[PDB]
Amino acid sequence: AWTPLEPKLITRLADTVRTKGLRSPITMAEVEALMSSPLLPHDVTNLMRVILGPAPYALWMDAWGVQLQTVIAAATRDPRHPANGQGRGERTNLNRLKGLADGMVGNPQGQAALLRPGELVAITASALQAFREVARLAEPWADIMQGPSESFVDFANRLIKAVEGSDLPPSARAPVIIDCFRQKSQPDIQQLIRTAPSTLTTPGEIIKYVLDRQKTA
Amino acid sequence: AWTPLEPKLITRLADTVRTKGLRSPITMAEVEALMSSPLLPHDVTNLMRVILGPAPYALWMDAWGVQLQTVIAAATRDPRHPANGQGRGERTNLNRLKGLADGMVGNPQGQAALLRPGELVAITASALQAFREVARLAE
Amino acid sequence: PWADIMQGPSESFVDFANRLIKAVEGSDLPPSARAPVIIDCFRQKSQPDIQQLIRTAPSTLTTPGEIIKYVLDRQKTA
Amino acid sequence: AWTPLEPKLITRLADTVRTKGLRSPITMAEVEALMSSPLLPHDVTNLMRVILGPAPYALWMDAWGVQLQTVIAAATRDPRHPANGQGRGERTNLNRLKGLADGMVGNPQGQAALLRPGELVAITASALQAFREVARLAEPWADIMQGPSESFVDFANRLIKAVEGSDLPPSARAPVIIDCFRQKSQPDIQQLIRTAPSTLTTPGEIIKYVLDRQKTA
Amino acid sequence: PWADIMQGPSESFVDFANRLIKAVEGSDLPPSARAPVIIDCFRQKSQPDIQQLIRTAPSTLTTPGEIIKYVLDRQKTA
Amino acid sequence: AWTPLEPKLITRLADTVRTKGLRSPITMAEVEALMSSPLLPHDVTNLMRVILGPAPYALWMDAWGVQLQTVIAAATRDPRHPANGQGRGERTNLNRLKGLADGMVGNPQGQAALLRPGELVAITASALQAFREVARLAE
Amino acid sequence: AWTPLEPKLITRLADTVRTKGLRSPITMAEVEALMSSPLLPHDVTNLMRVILGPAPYALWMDAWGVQLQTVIAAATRDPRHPANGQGRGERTNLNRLKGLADGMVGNPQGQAALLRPGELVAITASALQAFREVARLAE
Amino acid sequence: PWADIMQGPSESFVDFANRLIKAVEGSDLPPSARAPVIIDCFRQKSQPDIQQLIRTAPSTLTTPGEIIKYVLDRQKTA
Amino acid sequence: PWADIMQGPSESFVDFANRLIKAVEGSDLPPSARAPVIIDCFRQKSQPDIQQLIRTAPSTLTTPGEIIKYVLDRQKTA
Amino acid sequence: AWTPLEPKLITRLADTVRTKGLRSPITMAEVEALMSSPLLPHDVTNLMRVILGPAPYALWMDAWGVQLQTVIAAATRDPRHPANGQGRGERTNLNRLKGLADGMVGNPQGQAALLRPGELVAITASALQAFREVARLAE
């Protein structure tokens, strides 16, 4: 049996997206919260229709389709998908994932009837990844310098923000943040990091060291 | 079954940290309040992601790892840890504490399924001590 | 009126796209005529820098979402 | 039977190291060339004594010892090392690797007699890695800008050199080179790359595009 | 003579293209050598504003008609 | 047998294009008039050479090629094209449409010999659409 | 059995490229000289790594990939390629041409073992054409 | 003479180390007395910036190679 | 009074340490509170050159004797 | 039975350290003189408290602890230490060396009762080496 999400929670989430934006960690946490139980295509579609504006909604439809297509390629690459079955008669078409299949168009009850739990969780993960892509797309690290009067924690916050909210792979953020701490961060802190008797191999360790030995002023 | 923390409480706590700072006794009291029920690694990780800035979040990840490593050393020093079991097959690895083990990465439901209550309270106490360290360090 | 919408000299492109899609979808056009009109309004409105940016598209853009994505990628940061 | 390396090749390699330096790719290629056949500890030791100065030679002795110690730790962690044997009587001590064991000190003939081919190749790989470490140590990408009068191929050469000869992981060089092409490379080329109707996802493709559409001047 | 044709300081681009194509096609060149010559004369004649406009073409123009279309699109209205 | 168009009509049409322009409805009507009987590639090519200036003629050659390529794509998408035949040996190549095929280059008589009426009407419609495109583009 | 090229010849060729440039006829003659025996992907890759700067090396990798792709298209267009075999099990993938296939990555001995002489000569001709393209492009 | 070697105000550290190790190893000292002398000459020569850099070493450096590596890591880039 | 002791601009560090340890041990503090107080007074008194010298200690100093030894090693000879 | 050192000798040694310094050979000779009979931890501790200033005394406590720890490592590396016994019940802990063990804290008589002569000579040699280290370090 299908139960809709509370319009109160949806209104609160919409106002959160309206004030904080799409990319804030609080907004992503709230979306993860409302993305806890496996949702039917109807639920996610209406949710994104309500919380997102028109242009972000178009972008999100595109991204969701692309991610679902990647999922269906992986599904035809492995007959053991939790959305698939063992025989060929349970193969899952994109009409069944997007809610376009027979007996599902516009009807959430029938949707909940015919859909598999693996189908639901795959749709949900796809929608979450698409939301992440669109949020990263809707709103330069190598141009960030520590100002002459700026403190170091503000500079570190700004730099980590710009590096993590960029187009770099996830495995290339820490080395870039370290090497930007070393070459930016005006020459007093540059020499402070250079003359480190220990080897600092993490942005957190560099931040701790600099905060300990910084010139109080 | 996993239930997320209210984004309203999280928003209020984030604004508290924003105005009062990390070290005020009211902020530590609020953190203790939102640290009442044993949280899953997913919950604490997202909470610190939201309430802390980028650099304090990096520092907190470091400190949390160190404290969890101390906990795991004490656990291998005593087979009667509320996170451990009696046999060797229940020994708790850091992948299970940080939420990196199999069946847990990114999934809070599976996390809540496989985790022990002793595991949860140990993770929670470790995160609280790490928050205290980072707060004492930032200012 | 959708046919009177221009991208202001100082307006960003996402605001212009929002306003245009709003006015086109909330109008008297048939549902099957909104996407071509939105595309052809992106091409002829949207002041000549973005006009030339869309014109010199090595790929063929056949959807408002694709045009928006392309323009957001290659736009002149300012 | 031990055969020494030609002093003519060694003299040419020494002059190469003297003019080009320790870190040039031509120098590393020449070292790889003279590091082709498995060398005895005597050979590599004398080679580094001749081609390297005193201080780089001290650094190289240190690094070679450390790498050989890592090798011996891996050897005691696996009894199937091509330097080891099956029984415990064939376990290889560092005195046998550094040429300090009995019947080997100062005598290359006896050295070649008692040493294993696996021992030789392990010593050789260790010495090569130590040479790489010392070369990287003896002599900043995020500070590289394209000068107002500099051409683009010179800027690209300098940037790729400084990025590949740095402390970044191998999987983080291409994204960094791309994002440095985009943010450095003074605003004419910045706008030229920004308004690319195609998506450029490789430094070579960016270089080709810019060379095609650059402002001839 | 085709190799002596320059775009005057005040002349428009369509007049220059007409004159150049006329002089190149009504000359002693083989038929298979007219298009490359017309292109390379568009690139080296056609005073430096249009020269830089053709140089900084994100797409590769491989036909006199395509070059003419591109220049007519992105030309400096004056 | 090939019969050329009157140079008097062509001169009048050229002066019409010279005074009224390319886009006037009277000019398009006159072009439709002189585009009544199916013309051979030689006829249309010389007609556009005479009535159009050099730069519009280059643009028109480009547009005509593009439209003929679309026609040939539709032809390979349907073996029942009035230019095609039933077997594969009657498939129409662009060398036969542009008049570049064997036995046609520069010779209008041989052109009229080997060409099909469907070929002629397709070439004519393509040339008309290309003229419309260039006229809309020039001004 | 794989034998490496002399570092003396490679050093002389690198200095030739450094003083004369990429496009001089003497440089192309020297490259043709060092391109006489069919080289393994390892050999050509290291050779271009040493003689070319970073940016020309990136350009050359691009051009070499494109030319090898054209070769593989011609190979799937003709089952009688000296790199191909008669059955479908000998069809040559780009991982085998670029040296990325199984048993070849980083190992020149295994490379020389599994590669065909037709494969080697095709790789060599592709690399030579790519060098010509990059030399014509750089200056 | 090894005991007269000083690091010049403008000289780099690797040149000074090369010169010092050369003069110490090509001298009349016993082989077992070269490393301690090289270390104690690194510490007392090698103008006071590097002197303080070696003095404030959280680790104990017991080899000329280790001292050279440490100084090359933490040296003042200039 | 121990909490009023500062290292003078011209005073050496061993004299300051002697005076501070004297005043702290000859005071009303419990015996278990003297070492932490002496350490935290070394860190906050002892004019900013030595303050920064103690701050940038690659090792953790957890005893007044260790702090004194470290400072005496790495002090600015003057 | 414990007999204290003469305060006259201690006063003379303190004035020697005050005028000649810590490193003079006469001072080291005087210390060796007053370090002739094996002293109890109480004796050496009070002696260094009197003759050394506060900061050298802190340094000396550190160095004495380190040297005693090296001694205890050598003792656990050899069960035939003159401070150790044959069985495991005579193993000497650092609380017994520094005078911190049970029945010894603050009482020199009980100290002299329970301590071994090997313990006394090891403590004495450790204290002498620590004094040498601190003297070499202070100036």
CATH of domain H2-74: 1.10.1200.30
Cα separation, A185 vs D173, in Å, equals 22
Task: Report how this structure was experimentally obtained.
Answer: cryo-EM
Could you give the CA distance from residue H48 to residue H9 in angstroms, rounded to a whole number?
A: 10
Is residue A175 classed as helix, strand or coil in its secondary structure?
helix
- Smallest CA–CA distance, residue A140 to chain D, in Å, is 7
B72 Cβ neighbours under 8 A, 6+ residues apart: B92, B93, B94, B97
Q: Which of B7, B19, B78, B85 is nearest to B49 (CA)?
A: B7
For residues D59 and D137, give the distance between their C-alpha atoms in angstroms, rounded to a whole number.
9
Closest-approach residue (CA) in chain I for H57:
I58
How many Cα atoms occupy the beta-carbon half-sphere of D136 within 13 Å? 14
Residues 6+ apart with CB under 8 A from A96: A104, A114, A115, A119
Residue D206: CB atoms within 10 Å: 22
Cβ–Cβ gap J137/I73 under 8 Å: yes
CATH architecture of B1-138: Orthogonal Bundle (1.10)
D59 → chain H, closest CA residue: H65
- How many CB atoms sit inside 10 A of residue I58's CB? 15
Rounded CA-CA distance J76/F72 in Å is 95
How many residues make up chain J in this entry?
A: 139
Residue of I nearest to J133 (CA): I69
I13 contacts I50 by C-beta, under 8 angstroms: yes
Q: Which of J130, J127, J129, J104 is nearest to J115 (CA)?
A: J104
Task: Count the residues in chain E.
Answer: 78
Number of C-beta neighbours around residue A22 at 10 A: 21
Q: DSSP label at D207?
A: H
Distances (CA, A) of J24 to J16, J18, J57: 10, 11, 18
Neighbours of chain H (3+ CB pairs under 8 A): A, D, I
Query: What own/partner pairs with CB < 8 Å and gap ≥ 24 does G74-81 have?
Result: G81/G118, G81/G122
3-state SS of chain F: helix, strand, coil percent to 5?
70, 0, 30
Residue I11 dihedral angles phi and psi, to the nearest 5°: -75, 145
Q: What are phi and psi of H58, to 5 degrees?
A: -55, -30
8 Å CB contact of I58 and A192: no
Which tokens go with J74? 């050598």
Element at J122 (helix H, strand E): helix J117-138
Contacts of D1 (CB under 8 A, 6+ apart): D109, D112
Residue B44 exposed, middle or buried by CB count within 10 Å (0-12, 13-18, 19+):
buried
CA distances from residue A111 to A38, A47, F99 in whole angstroms, order as listed: 13, 16, 59
3-state secondary structure of B41: helix
Q: Which of A194, A195, A197 sits opposite H59 (nearest CB)?
A: A197
Q: Alpha-carbon Rg of chain A, whole angstroms?
A: 23
- The Cα angle at residue G20 between residues G14 and G22, in degrees rounded to 5: 70
User: Would you say D112 and D2 are in contact if contact means Cβ atoms under 8 Å apart?
Assistant: yes
Cα distances from A173 to residues A30, A164, A169, A181, J92, in angstroms, run 25, 7, 7, 12, 53
Instruction: Note whether D99 and D41 are within 8 A (CB).
Output: yes
How far does CA F115 lie from the centroid of its chain? 13
DSSP line for C14-67: HHHHHHHHHHHHTSSS-GGGHHHHHHHHHHHSSTHHHHHHHHT-SSPP-SHHHH
Cα R_g (chain D), whole angstroms: 23
Stretch (H or E) spanning C13: helix C13-25
Nearest partner of F64 among F117, F125, F137, F22, judged by Cα:
F125
Residue E40 CB coordination number (10 Å): 10
- Which residues are CB-contacts of F33 (< 8 A; sequence separation ≥ 6)? none
Cα separation, A208 vs A200, in Å, equals 10
Determine the residue among A182, A195, A198, A212 to mutate to test chain H binding: the one whose Cβ has the most chain H Cβ atoms within 10 Å: A195
Locus of tokens 């556009």 = F48
| Helices of type H across chain H | 13-25, 34-44, 48-55, 64-74
Inter-residue contact J104 to J116 (CB < 8 Å): no
Instruction: Please answer whether residues D141 and D176 qualify as being in contact, where contact means their C-beta atoms are separated by less than 8 angstroms.
Output: yes
Handedness of CA G87, G93, G97, G102 (dihedral sign): negative
CA-based torsion, B79, B80, B81, B84: positive or negative: positive
Contacts (Cβ under 8 Å, ≥6 apart) of E62: E39
Query: Which residue, chain included where needed, has tokens 């209550």?
Result: B117
Do residues F69 and F97 lie in contact, with contact meaning Cβ atoms separated by under 8 Å? Answer: no
Backbone angles phi, psi at H29, to 5 degrees: -75, 155
Q: Is the dihedral of CA J79, J84, J87, J90 positive or negative?
A: negative
The two counts, helices (H) then strands (E), for chain E are 4, 0
F122 within 8 A of F40, measured Cβ to Cβ: no
What is the residue whose two structure tokens read 């050899």?
A: J78
DSSP state of A78: -
Which of I21, I63, I73 minimises the CB distance to J62? I63
Largest CA distance in chain G: 49
Burial class (CB in 10 A: 0-12, 13-18, 19+), J134: buried
Q: What is the dihedral of CA H70, H75, H77, H78, to 10 degrees?
A: -140
Chain D CB contacts of H72 below 8 Å: 137-138
Contact, J20 vs J105, CB < 8 A?
A: no
Q: Which amino acid is at A81?
A: H
Q: What is the DSSP letter of A105?
A: T
State how far the alpha carbon of D95 is from the alpha carbons of D69, D101, D111, F53, in Å.
11, 5, 12, 91
CB contact under 8 A, E66 and F62: yes
d(Cα I75, Cα D195) in Å, to the nearest integer?
A: 58
- CA–CA dist I25, I18 (Å, integer): 11
Tokens describing residue H6 = 């000083």
Give the C-alpha separation, B115 to B127, whole Å.
16
Number of H helices, E strands in chain I: 4, 0
- Breaks in chain B, after residue numbers (C to N greater than 2.5 Å): none
User: Cβ contact (<8 Å) for A61 and C65?
Assistant: yes
**Cβ-count burial of F78 within 10 angstroms (0-12 exposed, 13-18 middle, 19+ buried)?**
exposed
Phi, psi (degrees; rounded to nearest 5) at D216 = -60, 115
Domain borders along chain D are 1-138, 141-213
CA distances (Å), origin A170, targets A60, A167, C73, D172: 22, 9, 20, 10
How would you label E5-32 residue by residue, b for 16+ Cβ within 10 Å and e otherwise?
Answer: bebeeeeebbebbbbbbbbbbeeeeeee
Q: What is the DSSP string of G11-76?
A: HHHHHHHHHH-SS-HHHHHHHHHHTSSPPPHHHHHHHHHHHS-HHHHHHHHHHHHHHHHHHHHHHH
Angle between helices C64-74 and A117-138 (to 10 degrees): 50
Question: Which residue is listed with tokens 């070493």?
Answer: H57
Q: Which residue of H has its CA nearest to D62?
A: H65
CATH architecture label of A141-213: Orthogonal Bundle (1.10)
Structure tokens at J105: 């804290």
Under an 8 A CB cutoff, do E22 and F54 touch? Answer: yes
Please state, as a whole number, how many other Cβ atoms lie within 10 Å of the Cβ of residue H26.
10
User: How many residues in chain G?
Assistant: 139
Q: Which two tokens stand for residue B92?
A: 């708790």
Which residue bears the tokens 């029938």? A110
Q: Which two tokens stand for residue F39?
A: 């013309």
Q: Which residues contact A187 (CB under 8 A, 6 or more apart)?
A: none
Nearest to A39 by CA among A95, A117, A114, A101: A117
| Resolution for this PDB entry, in angstroms | 7.8
Are the C-beta atoms of residues G58 and G137 closer than 8 Å to each other?
no
| A68: three-class secondary structure by DSSP | helix
- DSSP category for residue B88: G
Q: What is the DSSP string of A16-41?
A: HHHHH-SS-HHHHHHHHHHTSSPPPH
In one-letter notation, the amino acid at residue H11 is: E
Helices (H) and strands (E) in chain G, counts: 7, 0
Interior angle at CA B13, CA B11 and CA B17, nearest 5: 115
Amino acid at G4: P
- At residue F16's C-alpha, the angle toward residues F10 and F17, to 5°, is 90
Q: How far apart are CA F61 and CA E15, in angstroms?
A: 18
Residue H74 and residue A198: Cβ atoms within 8 Å? no
Sequence letter at residue F43: D
DSSP 8-state class, residue B40: P
Q: Which two tokens stand for residue E46?
A: 């056609």
D-H interface (Cβ pairs under 8 Å ≥ 3): yes
For residue F3, give both structure tokens.
């019969």
* Closest partner CB to D179 (pick from A142, A175, A179): A142
- Give the DSSP letter string of D43-83: HHHHHHHHHS-HHHHHHHHHHHHHHHHHHHHHHHT-TT-TT
Neighbouring C-beta atoms of residue A57, cutoff 10 Å: 18
The residues, any chain, with a CB within 8 Å of residue E21's CB and separated by 6 or more, are E38, E64, F54, F55, F57, F58
Cβ pair D168, A175 in contact under 8 A: yes
Distance CA A177, CA A170 (A): 12
Give exposure, A25-47, as e/b (b: 16+ Cβ within 10 Å).
Answer: bbbbbbbbbbbeebbbbbbbbbb
Q: Record the tokens describing residue G89, joined without a space.
A: 């099990």
SS3 state at D202: coil
* Integer Cα distance of B27 and B16 in angstroms: 7
CA distance G68 to G121: 12
Closest CA to D194 of A41, C71, A120: C71
Rounded Cα distance, G5 and C2, in Å: 70
Put simply, the answer to whether A202 touches B58 (Cβ < 8 Å) is yes
> Is E50 exposed, middle or buried, given 0-12, 13-18 or 19+ CB atoms closer than 10 A?
buried
**Encoded tokens for F107:** 């010779």
Q: Report how far residue G42's alpha carbon sits from residue G58's, in angstroms, rounded to the nearest whole number.
A: 16
Contact A182, A190 (CB under 8 A): yes
| Closest Cα in chain C to E76 | C48
